[PDB]
Design a protein around this ligand. Structure first.
Ligand code: ADP
Ligand code: ADP
Ligand code: MG
Ligand code: MG
Lengths: 259, 96, 262, 135, 128, 259, 262, 105, 107, 134, 136, 95
């Protein structure tokens, strides 16, 4: 014990209570100024280059690798109940509700999530964060707000392309390799669920994941030790903190408007 | 802290101070500022800066095409001290 | 006729102080040379002048109001007059080299597009980088990054150019480049220059006020010629390289008799 | 650059719009007056159940409710106003889509807003179907 | 806007808004039987094919060994005669079993009931 | 294109082919020497501190989240068929086959895959690799093969603890929260394949995923430019290359010994 | 009585080259100083001596057979006589500083536990780090990392102590410390030392053979005192650091009339 | 594939849906394009798409609905006994709720 | 709550598996521990588990193996008529198969 | 050392693609022919059986443009060669609800290209109801 | 620390084996003479088919033997050594588990020893001969 | 190799002072010094720092009996190494 075994609240407990709020103080000072539509117009397109199209190589080839491995596994136990014409109940419903914005959001932290903390960390290592705040304005509303406003529109532009490559990739093994039907695949998804309670949930569960993923990648790059060892710790910690932000937050989203 | 200009025939005497604050009423009016002006004199400026020395070379390309020669006298020593710093070769400054 | 009047500050971060009752004055027209070994404050002194970090209790002025705690809007209008460089080079690698020099004067003053090209290309002759206006700054030499930071530092109208550690490790081909660039800007613009290079076979030939300090306390505030001859074994370690002196140089152990026996 | 990245985000925005129309138009269906009836055994009926005349879908149902006096299951169903030439002599039947499927209203041909169709056909339960096979 | 103490209280208010979304996610009768079949708890009762309530639990008689089940009927429906028979019906073909109160012309018992018929002796009675 | 438009084979085509050859010689020159059992015995216990137990932080908290999202989603469309007693066929069977060693190998490339790439990269910037090579000892048998043999022993041992936490996590929503069964959930997995092609397929694809993940992360740290920007690009490349090594290799395994 | 001889080794890269017909010899008992600016090889020449990389055509001999074209087991027994240091500090952060200096002579030769403690501790007094033998190596000073790498550099049998760029940027309280370590090891053991420091006042006061070279070609092969006075404007630029000379100092890409008019 | 259209009128189509495989002898020869109704008598007037390889089809052919699945899926079979013709010899589908009434009564 | 064991000898147990529920009138009163065999007669000897809440069950209870659903597994029906620690139920009835019932209906 | 790291990369890439080349396997067979009148619900790659054991597979089923009769192309493996010409084919159903499979009833020798005359088609559910009730 | 890692690795290796015995002892499965038994109809038997007497499983099936002349399959079964008192009057049939389940061997019960062939067998009946004999 | 010979009370070393020869003279070094009054050796070629520990390890176990050990006959190489590592004068002859 009691005289020296209380280091988890007096020293370690205050340390974990300081990192959760420094990310909230910086984003509160970055969303109060009025953005200029005529000045940030060649600025937001540059932030969509190292985030948008540089994370597209893990979608065009790995997008068919999610729908095809369910097409082979939609034949082992499904043939025992003679539901081969009901393949749309496992290839359309299980690719956007509990699988769409939970793998692409986790793969967002590998290419366009881990490079954002490397972006701010490399500029702080080359003395560029302190070089901007003395000339014109602090870089909280100059180089971070384009990284955040392009960060909130990143998953609703990557989830709608991810759910169609799994449907098109899943149909390359259901009606071509197996060869069980030709019109029963596209008609089984029409009698399924529609625009009432799930596709309105996909557009609201993908934007709540784009906030909490970009909240940690822009915090570990701004709040880090300016040395060669601090940039290696920020790249290793932005994945395990975002893994608890998509795999730990989907449990409270599945318990909402799902019976 | 204003920039004014007075032609007075063939002088173009800049009465106001020369700085980088206001440059808009003298930028697009340079086509009617010099047509056949052969002498440039000024004795009421305070100091020159790095943004104002570009205006001294901007009045050469449209003045030599009309068929006249422009000389520059009466200026201070600050435009000659910065002449070696930017390595301005020719048709920019009289070097007097 | 000073520029910045700094008084006793400590700036203890969490456990230890960096300064202990320091004093400094910067004259108008001279070059202030603030040297020092590794361990006492050199770079963080320049950050306390600009006021980016929050200092401790102390009286520092800039011929007027207090620097770090005056306001928020007027503080940005008074900090733009310094426009210092950095050691590694404050060049943004995500953009071109034509925009790195054209950065601090694009939105500060109102300049048209053909007028902006005539003022950003003239400064490149002053450091010798006239052809360095259409290529990527991803590759450079050992001394080209310091010249590009100087070409963008004279874009505003400055009164002190704070050179943050120039030619700390360089070839003598480019170390002899920046020893004349200090004198050409002082004899033409008439402004003050702060060099903090901790090697003096060439700094004292161009500077006029040297600042040698040790054990985080100021001890020498003389000129560049009256500090070489003085009877004290504290500042002579910095002038010529010797083995012994005020440095410990050995770091002795406990007893030197019973150790390394078992 | 300031123009090469404009082309890469140009083909990226149209790729999301092409992928958007592939799931709500090709995968799923195209998305852009009431009646009264009283049954005796509805079986496993629920809300949003499709009503059928001839063998095609013409609409859904509003709700399923009851009566605190007669204790009979009254169903509220709605159809399109274009199919209003159906005669009143039409037995509402609750059938299933094949052997194992959802229970849908299978109406046959032999109206006004709020017409209580009296001739109905209740759903079949398995406790007396196998009882009539033996007895 | 402080540095360390102003950022503490905003963390619980975001955590308290998350636990509130995951937190929230009649009169009985008695009717005995002889063979209830495969019924269990939370089984819906009916008055002819429409759900009006569920059951509470399943108990037995400790002296005569017959299944006696309880069931819940909502207070909106009260006029139920004593000659109302109760049979054990199935929903569809493969679905679970349920109770259906056949209406005829709190604490009350049902005399006329009908137990579930297992099809293991129906095919044997059809031949023998 | 044809004169100058052939840069994808002469310059870009030779860049991809050159990195495949350097990874082959790095594995061949590190697995031919005889390992000393008396010398590497305090060496392997140190290598399991930043690989095995350091990656166990994301398993004990997110391992219950895999079984809790499948328990709630195995109730929306299951009530139409009244198949609630077969919950072990939907929770236990659908976890050890293609959900276990794929999610756990994807998380291994973020905590252990990204740290092993940065650890070799920081030692090349401080020039710690060639200092061992200078005296006598090759670094391929000193800092490489302990980091290679620990990867093929961690991921088969990280997946057998991953399948148990999701089966127990499936029971929190299977018999505790929902309450549909008490003993029928544990007996539904009793009628499945115990050790014929189910548990042995959880071992043969996990030790293959243990090879292809640790081969790229050790090569990207060995083929990194020793600058401040070289160790940041290598940490972003080891996640996108291992993502195609887990999802891209999964397609050729569902066509082998799976019907 | 030469130790290592290099005969026209080029080491041509994929698009450019580093050396063009160089000639380098090292005498026994003297200090070889390899100087030069950025543009030539400084640290890549000594990697051809150890054999970590494969060079181009040419012969380099460590008084015997060819170094980079021999067997693997023979190369590990000849390279142990060098035991060079590094610029950034070849110290392992996972272990203590007592195990950093011990790491060579633990796995090379066989010493028991009372005998090993009497050999690694006595080597730290020559560099002044005996009291600093029980602390974590996570924090050091600007010149303390080069003293710990030099104390482990002489744990084996020394023949070629290649100082990998020492005191390139340092404070003058250690400038007269590390250059003394060049003179102490060369005189007491009689072994050869190779320094590649390009700072002109410090290395030329302790060396006897300077090698000034530029434009990837060797031009000076004399002593340290016979290269100061010679009539050629090629080596006086490196000795006396000035702005102009053989360098263009403009980086030309035009004529300074085509730009800045619009 | 070049196909030519036909028409047929039934009484109760059963569970025939869109894109239903029409066949002859168990081998599929086309799909069902669209299922229509009559505006007055409300009869299912189906259309058929037969490929160009099968042209010798007499007008005395009979169409009858057969079951191809327990989930409602059915299919048409052309029993042999141009452009815009209508087959008159048709037979309606069977309902499990209707065929049990004849066996009981 | 301390469950007492019993024994029962049949001739054909059918599709019985482990942990099968026993029933008295449709309600589960216990489980089945294991299914054993006799090495001299080759008859399925299955033990039963009945809780202590009901004890006065006679030994003339007709044990008939019924099916759990309609096409799945099977279970035990403890049809009481008119037992202690370690007893055997005498009145036993075997289960049925589909191939033997169609042989009597055909011939 | 440039070409040394190039030739080794071709050998590892060719060895990796060698295990992925022959993978869609999980035979000098002779083809058969049969003409039925109503196949039923057979599909491609359906196994043919003689007495419960699998003996081969069915390649495809093409229609005749002259008589409009279904022609099935069933195949027999390397065994089961000695069979008389008096055999008969009858399509059966595997189990109670499974897929259909061709069955050869044992009754010269059928060579490569010979057809069988004795064939038995399937029985549709619409025919057994109309025959039992009427 | 070279001591704190040993007590965290050692509790991790025991977690891998308690998770291994939970899927081995609490699973489906964790000295058998063979016989010969020819047949006429197999139907749905495969490898490791359950051999049963009286409904409870007593053995497994190793492989399958075929006849090149009469085309009659021979199922190679494996009776455990605990039961060696099978008479010669007992036959062997192939029954189905329930209605839609898998197929299994059901022996309806000189002493049968190793290296013997069962001659009395009536396996099953196919569905095509069930409807064809009921109607005709 | 390294050889040892007493020759009365001198403890003369005739073998070469190498870095791999301290292994046989490690378990018998406790009984090696027995009343040695003058360490003398003249048959060595060079002295290494790894072999320099034996000249310092022979002082502590020999001074506890009550007798001093003089060290003469050595070259000046061990005295240039004496100032190099700052060897103390209480265990060194300082000649
Ligand atoms: N914000 C900070 N975080 C950690 N350490 C600091 C910080 N500011 C100063 N220091 C420490 O204080 C010391 C002051 O040295 P300084 O003169 O600032 O070095 P430099 O001139 O290289 O910046 C440094 O060694 C540094 O480690
Ligand atoms: N592996 C490599 N990749 C890229 N460039 C290299 C490599 N090796 C050498 N170079 C180039 O060759 C030049 C040789 O300079 P060098 O003396 O090695 O510099 P330093 O002493 O700072 O290492 C360097 O400028 C470097 O850019
Ligand atoms: Mg600094
Ligand atoms: Mg270097």
């Amino acid at each position: 014990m009691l005289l020296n075994a209380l280091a988890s609240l007096g020293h370690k407990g205050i340390k974990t209570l300081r990192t959760f709020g420094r990310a909230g103080l910086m984003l509160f000072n970055a969303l109060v100024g009025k953005p200029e539509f005529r000045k940030h117009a060649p600025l937001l397109v540059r932030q969509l280059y190292n985030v948008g199209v540089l994370s597209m190589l893990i979608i065009v080839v790995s997008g068919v690798f999610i729908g095809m491995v369910l097409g082979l596994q939609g034949y082992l136990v499904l043939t025992t109940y003679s539901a081969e014409t009901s393949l749309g109940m496992l290839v359309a419903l299980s690719l956007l509700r509990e699988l769409g914005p939970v793998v692409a959001a986790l793969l967002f932290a590998g290419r366009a999530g881990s490079a954002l903390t490397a972006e701010i960390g490399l500029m702080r290592a080359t003395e560029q964060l302190s070089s901007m705040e003395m000339m014109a304005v602090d870089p909280l509303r100059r180089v971070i707000s384009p990284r955040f406003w392009a960060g909130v529109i990143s998953l609703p532009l990557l989830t709608v392309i991810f759910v169609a490559v799994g449907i098109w990739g899943g149909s390359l093994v259901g009606v071509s390799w197996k060869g069980i039907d030709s019109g029963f695949f596209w008609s089984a998804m029409q009698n399924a669920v529609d625009w009432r309670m799930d596709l309105v949930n996909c557009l609201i569960k993908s934007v709540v994941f784009a906030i909490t993923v970009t909240w940690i990648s822009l915090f570990n790059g701004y709040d880090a030790i300016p040395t060669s060892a601090g940039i290696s710790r920020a790249t290793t910690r932005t994945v395990v903190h975002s893994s608890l932000a998509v795999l730990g937050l989907d449990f409270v989203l599945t318990a909402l408007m799902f019976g | 802290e204003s920039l004014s200009w007075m032609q007075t025939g063939d002088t173009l005497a800049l009465s106001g101070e020369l700085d980088q604050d206001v440059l808009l009423p003298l930028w697009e009016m340079r086509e009617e500022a010099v047509k056949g002006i052969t002498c440039i004199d000024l004795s009421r400026v305070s100091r020159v800066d790095t943004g104002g020395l570009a205006l001294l070379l901007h009045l050469i390309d449209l003045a030599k095409k009309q068929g006249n020669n422009v000389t520059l006298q009466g200026v201070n020593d600050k435009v000659y001290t910065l002449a070696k710093l930017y390595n301005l070769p020719a048709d920019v400054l009289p070097r007097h | 006729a000073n520029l910045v009047d700094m008084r006793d500050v400590s700036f203890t971060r969490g456990n230890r102080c960096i300064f202990d009752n320091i004093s400094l004055t910067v004259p108008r027209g001279k070059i202030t040379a603030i040297m020092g070994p590794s361990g006492i404050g050199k770079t963080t002194l320049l950050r306390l002048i600009g006021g980016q970090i929050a200092p401790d209790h102390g009286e520092i002025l800039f011929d007027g109001e207090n620097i770090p705690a005056m306001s928020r809007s007027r503080l940005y209008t008074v900090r733009k007059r310094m426009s210092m460089l950095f050691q590694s080079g404050a060049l943004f690698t995500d953009m071109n080299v034509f925009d790195n020099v054209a950065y601090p004067l694009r939105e500060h003053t109102q300049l048209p597009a053909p007028l902006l090209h005539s003022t950003v290309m003239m400064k490149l002759e002053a450091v010798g980088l006239r052809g360095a206006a259409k290529l990527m700054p991803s590759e450079l030499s050992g001394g080209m990054a310091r010249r590009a930071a100087l070409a963008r530092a004279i874009a505003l109208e400055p009164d002190l150019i704070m050179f943050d550690e120039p030619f700390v490790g360089q070839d003598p081909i480019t170390m002899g480049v920046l020893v004349k660039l200090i004198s050409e800007l002082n004899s033409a613009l008439g402004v003050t220059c702060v060099v903090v290079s901790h090697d003096v076979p060439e700094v004292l030939s161009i500077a006029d006020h040297a600042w040698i300090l040790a054990d985080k306390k100021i001890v020498a505030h003389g000129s560049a010629q009256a500090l070489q001859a003085n009877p004290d074994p504290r500042v002579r370690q910095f002038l010529d390289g010797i083995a012994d002196g005020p440095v410990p140089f050995r770091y002795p152990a406990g007893d030197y008799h019973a150790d390394l026996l078992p | 650059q300031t123009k090469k990245n404009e082309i890469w985000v140009g083909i990226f925005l149209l790729a999301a719009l092409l992928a958007a129309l592939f799931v709500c138009l090709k995968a799923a269906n195209v998305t852009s007056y009431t009646l009264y009836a009283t049954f005796d055994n509805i079986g496993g009926l629920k809300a949003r159940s499709p009503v059928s005349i001839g063998g095609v879908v013409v609409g859904r149902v509003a709700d399923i409710t009851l009566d605190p006096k007669t204790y009979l299951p009254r169903v509220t169903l709605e159809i399109e106003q274009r199919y209003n030439h159906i005669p009143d002599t039409s037995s509402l039947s609750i059938r299933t889509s094949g052997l194992l499927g959802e229970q849908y209203l299978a109406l046959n041909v032999g109206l006004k807003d709020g017409d209580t169709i009296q001739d109905t056909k209740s759903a079949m339960v398995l406790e007396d179907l196998i009882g009539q096979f033996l007895y």
